[PDB]
Amino acid sequence: MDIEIAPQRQEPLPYVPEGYSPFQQDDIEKLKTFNSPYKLDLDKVDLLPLEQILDPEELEDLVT
């Protein structure tokens, strides 16, 4: 006897909460990268103003 058929299962259009923006791999990369804590925090020339207001024995004793 002939067999009855069924429609192909479709993927529902992905749900994302309003205005949500996922973290890309560039962002996760910055999250797991250790940097030194001691790493310090990251041309016209002007002139400077002015303010207003012996025997051999005494030689050894010399160094000893």
Binding site: L31, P37, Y38
Partner: protein, 1488 residues
């Protein structure tokens, strides 16, 4: 490095010992010694061991003197120069350069004695005559070159002076003037020369003795130092040496230029003191030759040893002001040569008179001259003059100002190479000033890196000249240059270098040995962090505390910034890993050592506060807050200390969970006092490090703003806060910056907290859709992350989540992952993580055991042990409970009270049997357990359930509270007659509707909120919905519609089936509980149903139907589906005969005849009167318990003609016998004549069924709860032929009716605007064929109608179909969710009646204790009044038979409504359950 020093000390001791023995051998071998002397001079200078430089000079000075005693004067001379050049910045070519060498801290201990040694050699080589003008210059300014040494060898110096007077052929008067001066100034005996001292004075006034030649210039400087000592005595006058005509005519020549032009001096020598004033003033009145005269003037002023005077200093300022005023007027280079000449002699004057601030002026003139002339030559003279000041001034504090000074110098250099050339003048070992502290080295090198080095712009490693090893390590430590040969330096130096950078690729005589411990714990700390581990975190913390931090006053030294930044990082890392015990010990220790660590106390206070809070030491935490809040002010604090003080006050427990108080402070108070803590746009342009710390502050505030909101019934704003926090975190990351470890750790905690909070909020409202999203998002970030404490914490959180949504496979996996993650952290130091671990693995005794070990005698001051009781389900004393955790406490109390009460009742066989009996609430008209006790304990339970606030409950808990509230009312109304019997059932009716209403409500609100709320740095209340839900019921009851509204629910507690009916026409409310346990519970029926559906569904999939081709496999397909179709029929039959037997009449649409019922009620009570033992033997008829009318009616609705009539009637007997029993009417079944009951009732029922008037209700609304949805209720035999539609809540129903003026069935026009989609993916050709004809025929004769066939519809196409149609049908897979997102459908307010034919279009995915979701609810939220769908997957031929008959029977005359049409169309399917039972209807019944 000591065996190195001992080797060279051995050589020096050999030389100095054997040289004196045999002078010939050692002279030729002096090269080996110069090697060793230089070898150690280099080492000791490189390792900053200044103290051993002194002990080397002593052995070196001893070598010099033994060369002199053996008359090797040549070597001795070049040894003096050797010693000097190895231990000074300035260099020497001859002994002349030694004699005029200034005093600095580098030569303080030998310079004078070295000079005396020099004079000894000059004398012994008879070079006095040639050295005469330098030796005269020496003693002329003896106050500068010699008279600075406090331990100056007096007797040796004067004796030298005397011997020079003896051999000199000129200036014999000047050497005697000094000799007499040194004798009286240093108290000494004159008897080192028999002739008297008076005759010695007169013996110098000879013609040949006063002869000075051209060195008559120095005469005045010697006489001054002589006579000023000898005032009022036997003073050799000036008129003894110089005659009158030569002294008097000086004054007279002045009164009438006037300087010796060829000799750079004034015309006259030995100028008087007051006569100089008329010379100085005369010069102030004044092209390029004018500078030449200004030289001659000031040159003479040096030569005249006149003490500092105001008239001189006043002209000094006038001179230099005139110089700077006319720098630009100098064009030629001869005039520039004079400028450098004058500025040179003027600076010499300052050092004589000790005028450091006036020297600074000359430096500025040299600088200005350099810029205007664009002369590097001048700029080098400027830099070197400043460094000369540094050595001479000898101040470490001044050194900070000179670095800023040098910053201006380097920026002015005329090229890149010239810039580096200037820098090396600053970056020089002798700028250390023999400082043996780590603090100064770091302060100097980091300052020189920020202000100077970054101006050099170099990309290769430059080994800066004459700099130490330590200096290079610290300087290049802060650089980012790749290839630095660190392996050349000492390990201690390399260890600082490595800690200063992010790389780790890894002597007793060293400065750093004094800090060996500190240096290596900083290395070990930074090493762990880079590996993302904590293997040594505990050990180095205790080590730093006991072996360094406590030895603070012992070491007695100012703390380096090396140690400061380590503390700030240690406190941070300890905080990040929840080593809260160690954090407390460390922070309290630092606060105790305020004397040295005061500048770091604001950090210690921040992390101490967060420590108490982490261990829930709220008493200590609250004390700390009130102290901090009143001590320090924000208006004057730096942004860093302000950020730290505000960030510590963000925790919820510090505000008693008072949202309005929290909002006042961080919303109004803080921004008014320190606005730049909220400048997330950096309008004030902070340094990138601070800006991120500001962004981090606001993230932490929003995250905490969410916790308070959600614990205050503000779910919407709580969501908005969490979204704001994550949006800032995104903008933070995209800042082009190398994220510091401190801010990375902080952001990791904030970001995970954000995900945790988001999921917890959606768990509370039961949204499984959002929970599933954020869960996967979180689960993705963890994957690549490596931070153990973050990973474990998240895995532990996900495990809890998967338990809630009952995803057992992911539940098992994440438990294993979390367990393995826990090995990667210290269980001894981290109690908060330890307890979580012990909780997950069901080790509760060990959990509370490990708590008392951790705190010990501190356990009284922590809420954590009580907090875990709340987590375990216990309820605690109200007086000891934290006000914030009071809601959880009350809930636990309610469940604990109920468990204890139900337990004590179930041990009495009377109540044990009552919980196992069918119970109704309006049932009657108004050991051995005591009755009044039971009533009392239940009235207390009832009043407690009514006491709790409903906005503090997650939707699943509210569900339990409602079904627990009903059960109490049911049991109580069967035992007695409670106060306000009806109003109690009305509210309890609307109570159970809240858990149905709220999830659907939140879903609608959350999808329609504006997106602009998330990017700017609506709320609902359970109160207003409580009114809405009780008014929705009041409106249904008052509509007087002739319908039945029957709810079907499942009780989690009891496991009972809960039915509730509403009758708007009869104005009657009824409810009954069915103990379900041929026997299967509700979960067992669900497991059997799901098993069938899942098998039938995967037989439907194209994955299977494709691979079947043979005739023999067609049989296997049909045989399996035949079986599944029987498996379900039998399942529905078990449900039909076990759960509802005897109460099916509860669903009967039949309404009884009022005149006949009252007659039956007479006979009914008659039959009970005659056959019931209690009514035959006790009391009188007026004391008999009366049964409610709706129960009596259940008999009349029985059919005697049915086959199992007696089975159903018998169950009703028990139900009535139980109503009477519980109200106190015992009737032993042994004494009941069931024969008579059977016969007499069957007779009276038949007499009714043959005379009854056949009227009935119009429609039945099933309020099917989301847990009962998957059951095909409409296919039970007593519901099969009824007009039925499903509905999710009373509110949803009442809205639908109120919307259409309460007219049933809903009329909907069909003559226009109809939408239809047929075979959108072309996977249903056979289906497409049958309907292709009729659909196109319609749109041909239907205006504004549309059809989409064999074509994937765009989203904005059916979005206007749904909203602008009178009818929308769809034939494909699902409900077309693959063509339109859930968001946009839920954004609609009105949607056309939808016919969602196709697989699983009414199916839902279930997520444990969270609310399930499906496209069926999506349409209802869009405004759809009628949606028809399939509960599971169906096959085409059967469903299209159905669809055809559906359209025909509905008129798509007196056609059928959608309800009747469906029920009358289920029979066309060959598989009447696997396909026929699938379609279902939600909403209002419609008719075309």
């Amino acid at each position: 490095s000591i065996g190195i020093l001992a080797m060279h000390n051995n050589i020096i001791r050999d030389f100095t010992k054997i040289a004196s023995n045999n002078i010939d051998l050692a002279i030729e071998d002096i090269t080996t010694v110069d090697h060793s002397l230089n070898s150690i001079y280099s080492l000791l200078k490189s390792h900053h061991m200044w103290g051993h430089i002194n002990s080397t000079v002593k052995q070196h000075l001893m070598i010099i003197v033994k060369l002199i005693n053996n008359n090797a004067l040549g070597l001795a001379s070049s040894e003096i120069i050797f010693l000097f050049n190895e231990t000074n910045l300035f260099q020497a070519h001859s002994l002349k350069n030694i004699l005029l060498a200034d005093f600095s801290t580098w030569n303080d201990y030998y310079l004078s004695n070295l000079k005396i040694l020099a004079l000894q050699i000059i004398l012994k080589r008879k070079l006095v005559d040639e050295y005469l003008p330098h030796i005269l210059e020496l003693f002329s300014h003896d106050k500068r070159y010699l008279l600075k040494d406090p331990n100056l060898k007096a007797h040796a110096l004067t004796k030298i002076v005397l011997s020079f007077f003896s051999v000199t052929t000129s200036c014999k008067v000047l050497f005697g003037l000094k000799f007499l001066q040194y004798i009286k100034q240093f108290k000494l005996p004159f008897k080192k020369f028999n002739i008297t001292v008076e005759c010695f004075s007169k013996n110098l006034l000879h013609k040949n003795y006063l002869e000075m030649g051209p060195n008559k210039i120095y005469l005045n400087s010697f006489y001054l130092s002589y006579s000023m000592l000898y005032d009022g005595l036997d003073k050799i006058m000036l008129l003894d040496i110089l005659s009158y005509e030569e002294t008097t005519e000086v004054q007279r020549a002045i009164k009438s230029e006037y300087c010796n032009m060829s000799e750079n001096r004034l015309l006259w020598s030995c100028i008087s003191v007051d006569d100089l004033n008329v010379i100085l003033e005369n010069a102030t009145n004044f092209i390029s030759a004018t500078l030449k005269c200004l030289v001659c003037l000031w040159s003479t002023i040096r030569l005249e040893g006149l003490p500092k005077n105001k008239d001189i200093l006043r002209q000094f300022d006038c001179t230099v002001i005139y110089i700077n005023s006319n720098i630009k007027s100098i064009n030629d280079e001869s005039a520039a040569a004079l400028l450098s000449e004058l500025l040179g002699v003027l600076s010499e004057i300052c050092i004589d008179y000790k005028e450091p601030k006036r020297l600074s002026n000359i430096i500025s003139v040299l600088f200005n001259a350099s810029v205007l002339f664009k002369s590097h030559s001048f700029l080098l003279k400027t830099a070197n003059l400043e460094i000369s000041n540094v050595l001479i001034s000898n101040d470490s504090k001044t050194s900070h100002r000179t670095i800023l000074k040098f910053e201006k110098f380097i920026s002015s250099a005329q090229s890149a190479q010239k810039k580096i050339e200037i820098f090396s003048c600053l970056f020089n070992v002798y700028c250390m000033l023999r400082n043996d502290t780590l603090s100064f080295v770091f302060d100097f090198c980091q300052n020189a890196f920020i202000h100077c080095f970054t101006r050099l712009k170099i990309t290769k490693f430059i080994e800066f000249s004459n700099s130490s090893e330590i200096m290079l390590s610290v300087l290049y430590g802060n650089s980012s240059i790749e290839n630095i040969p660190s392996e050349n330096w000492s390990q201690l130096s390399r260890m600082i270098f490595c800690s200063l950078r992010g790389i780790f690729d890894l002597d007793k005589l060293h400065l750093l040995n004094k800090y060996e411990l500190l240096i290596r714990i900083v290395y070990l700390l930074n090493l762990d962090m880079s590996k993302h581990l904590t293997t040594n975190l505990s050990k180095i913390t205790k080590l730093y505390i006991n072996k360094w931090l406590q030895k603070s006053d012992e070491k007695a030294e100012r703390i380096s910034s090396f140690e400061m930044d380590f503390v700030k990082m240690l406190l941070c890392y300890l905080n990040f890993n929840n080593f809260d015990k160690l954090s407390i010990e460390l922070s309290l220790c630092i606060k105790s050592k305020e004397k040295y660590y005061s500048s770091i106390v604001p950090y210690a206070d921040n992390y101490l506060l967060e420590a108490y809070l982490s261990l829930y030491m709220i008493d200590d935490a609250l004390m700390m807050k009130n102290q901090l809040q009143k001590t320090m002010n924000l208006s004057t604090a730096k942004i860093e200390q302000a950020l730290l003080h505000a960030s510590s006050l963000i925790n919820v427990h510090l505000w008693d969970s008072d949202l309005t108080a929290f909002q006042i402070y961080f919303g109004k108070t803080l921004p008014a006092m320190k606005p730049e803590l909220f400048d997330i746009n950096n309008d004030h342009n902070l340094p990138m490090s601070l800006y991120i710390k500001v962004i981090l502050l606001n993230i932490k505030i929003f995250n905490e703003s969410a916790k308070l909101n959600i614990k205050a019934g503000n779910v919407i704003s709580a969501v908005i806060d969490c979204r704001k926090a994550q949006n800032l975190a995104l903008s933070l990351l995209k800042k082009k910056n190398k994220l510091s470890q401190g801010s990375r750790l902080a952001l990791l905690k904030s970001l995970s907290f954000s995900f945790f909070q988001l999921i917890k909020i959606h768990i509370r409202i039961g949204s499984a859709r959002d929970c599933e999203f954020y869960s996967k998002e979180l689960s993705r970030i963890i994957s690549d992350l490596e931070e153990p404490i973050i990973v474990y914490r998240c895995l532990h959180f996900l495990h809890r989540y998967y338990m809630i949504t009952e995803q057992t496979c992911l539940q098992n996996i994440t438990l294993g992952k979390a367990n393995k993650a826990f090995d990667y952290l210290d269980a001894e130091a981290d109690i908060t993580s330890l307890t979580m671990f012990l909780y997950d693995n069901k080790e509760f005794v060990k959990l509370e055991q490990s708590l008392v070990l951790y705190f010990g005698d501190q356990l009284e001051k922590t809420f954590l042990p009580n907090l875990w009781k709340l987590h375990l389900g216990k309820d605690i004393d109200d007086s000891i409970c934290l006000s914030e955790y009071m809601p959880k406490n009350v809930i636990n109390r309610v469940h604990n009270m109920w468990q204890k009460v139900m337990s004590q009742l179930e041990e009495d066989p009377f109540f044990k049997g009552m919980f196992e009996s069918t119970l109704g609430i309006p049932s009657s008209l108004p050991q051995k357990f005591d009755r009044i006790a039971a009533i009392s304990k239940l009235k207390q339970m009832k009043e407690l359930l009514e006491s709790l606030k409903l906005d503090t409950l997650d939707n699943h808990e509210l569900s339990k509270i409602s079904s627990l509230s009903s059960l109490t009312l049911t049991i109580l109304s069967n035992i007695t007659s409670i106060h306000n019997a009806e109003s109690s059932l009305i509210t309890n009716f609307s109570l159970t509707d809240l858990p149905r209403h709220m999830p659907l409500l939140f879903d609608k609100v959350l999808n329609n909120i504006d997106n602009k709320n998330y990017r700017e740095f609506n709320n609902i209340s359970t109160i207003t919905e409580s009114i809405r839900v009780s008014a929705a019921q009041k409106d249904l009851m008052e509509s007087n519609l002739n319908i039945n509204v029957i709810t079907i629910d499942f009780c989690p507690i009891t496991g009972n089936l809960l039915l509730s009916k509403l009758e708007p026409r009869r104005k009657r409310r009824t409810h009954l509980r069915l103990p379900l346990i041929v026997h299967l519970s509700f979960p067992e029926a669900t497991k059997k149903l799901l098993s069938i559906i899942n098998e039938s569904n995967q037989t439907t999939s194209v994955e299977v139907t494709n691979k079947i081709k043979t005739r023999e496999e067609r049989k296997s397909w049909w045989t399996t589906r035949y079986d599944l179709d029987k498996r379900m029929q039998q399942l529905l039959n078990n449900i039909e005969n076990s759960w509802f037997n005897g109460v099916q009449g509860f669903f009967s649409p039949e309404v009884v005849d009022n005149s006949l019922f009252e007659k039956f009620k007479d006979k009914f009570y008659e039959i009970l009167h005659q056959n019931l033992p209690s009514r035959k033997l006790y009391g009188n008829p007026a004391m008999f318990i009366k049964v409610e009318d709706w129960v009596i009616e259940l008999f009349l609705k029985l059919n005697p003609q049915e086959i199992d009539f007696l089975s159903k009637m018998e169950d009703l007997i028990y139900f009535v016998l139980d109503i009477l029993l519980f109200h106190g009417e015992e009737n032993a079944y042994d004494e009941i004549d069931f024969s008579m009951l059977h016969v007499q009732l069957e007779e009276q029922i038949k007499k009714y069924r043959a005379t009854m008037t056949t009227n009935s209700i119009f429609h039945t609304f099933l309020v099917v709860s989301s847990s009962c949805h998957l059951f095909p209720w409409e296919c039970l035999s007593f519901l099969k032929d009824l007009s039925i539609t499903r509905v999710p809540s009373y509110v949803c129903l009442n809205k639908l009716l109120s919307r259409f003026h309460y007219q049933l069935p809903l009329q909907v026009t069909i003559e226009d605007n109809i939408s239809m989609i047929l075979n959108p993916n072309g996977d249903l050709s056979r289906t497409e064929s049958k309907f292709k004809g009729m659909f196109q025929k319609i749109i041909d004769a239907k205006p504004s109608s549309q059809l989409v066939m064999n074509e994937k519809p765009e989203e904005e196409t059916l979005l206007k179909m749904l909203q602008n149609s009178n009818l929308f049908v769809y034939i494909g897979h699902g409900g077309g969710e693959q063509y339109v997102r859930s968001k946009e459908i839920k954004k609609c307010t009105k949607i056309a009646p939808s016919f969602l034919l196709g697989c699983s279009s009414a199916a839902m995915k279930y997520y444990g204790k969270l609310e399930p979701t499906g496209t069926i609810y999506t349409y209802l939220l869009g405004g759809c009044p009628m949606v028809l769908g399939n509960l599971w997957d169906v096959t085409d031929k059967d469903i299209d038979k159905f669809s055809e008959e559906l359209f025909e029977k509905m008129g798509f005359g007196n056609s059928l409504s959608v309800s009747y049409a469906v029920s009358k169309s289920r029979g066309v399917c060959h598989l009447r359950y696997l396909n026929g039972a699938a379609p279902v209807i939600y909403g209002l019944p419609i008719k075309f």
